[PDB]
Amino acid sequence: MPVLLGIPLLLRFLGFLLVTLFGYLLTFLKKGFGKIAIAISLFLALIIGLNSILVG
Amino acid sequence: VSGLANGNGATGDFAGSNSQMAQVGDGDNSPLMNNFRQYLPSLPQSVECRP
């Protein structure tokens, strides 16, 4: 299906930006699931900590 | 987050809290609240009635 000389490269580029940008969203998602790991850890560590004082 | 509550376990970044959540316990038995039990006041027992 005949096309001009530059259209096939505009169509390949408009799906490079999309995969790059959808690649960044993934990186940031994974980071925010690491915050909920730090948070949980902290809480349970403060509980185990108080126990050791009171029983002493 | 569901396995740290079900008591099934967690594998990933939540793999450090699988030993902190074993100290909490499950049911009636809690390793944390059984530390308080070596220091319980010794109360006498029950015997039959003597005059």
From Swiss-Prot, chain A:
Its main location: virion. GO terms for cellular component: host cell membrane; membrane; virion component. GO terms for biological process: symbiont entry into host cell. The keyword Transmembrane helix applies. It is a multi-pass membrane protein. Keywords: Host membrane, Membrane, Transmembrane, Transmembrane helix, Viral penetration into host cytoplasm, Viral penetration into host cytoplasm via pilus retraction, Virion, Virus entry into host cell. It is found in: Virion; Host membrane. The chain crosses the membrane at residues 3-23, 36-56. The keyword Transmembrane applies. Interacts with G3P; this interaction is required for proper integration of G3P and G6P into the virion. Plays essential roles both in the entry of the viral genome into the bacterial host and in budding process. The formation of the G3P-G6P complex termed adsorption complex is essential for correct termination of filamentous phage assembly. Belongs to the inovirus G6P protein family. This is Head virion protein G6P. It comes from Enterobacteria phage f1. The lineage of its organism: Viruses, Monodnaviria, Loebvirae, Hofneiviricota, Faserviricetes. The chain holds residues 1 to 56 of 112 of the full protein.
Curated annotation (Swiss-Prot), chain B:
It comes from the Viruses. Interacts with G6P; this interaction is required for proper integration of G3P and G6P into the virion. Interacts with G8P. Interacts with the tip of the host pilus. Interacts (via N-terminus) with host TolA. Interacts (via transmembrane domain) with host TolQ (via 2nd and 3rd transmembrane domains); this interaction allows the phage translocation across the host inner membrane. Interacts (via transmembrane domain) with host TolR (via transmembrane domain); this interaction allows the phage translocation across the host inner membrane. It is found in: Virion; Host membrane. Belongs to the inovirus G3P protein family. Consists of 3 domains (N1/D1, N2/D2, and CT) separated by glycine-rich repeats and a C-terminal transmembrane segment. The N2 domain interacts with the F pilus, whereas the N1 domain forms a complex with the C-terminal domain of TolA at later stages of the infection process. The C-terminal domain is required for release of viral particles from the host bacterial membrane and proper integration of G3P and G6P proteins in the virion. Plays essential roles both in the penetration of the viral genome into the bacterial host via pilus retraction and in the extrusion process. During the initial step of infection, G3P mediates adsorption of the phage to its primary receptor, the tip of host F-pilus. Attachment of the phage causes pilus retraction bringing the viral particle into close proximity of the host cell inner membrane. This is Attachment protein G3P.
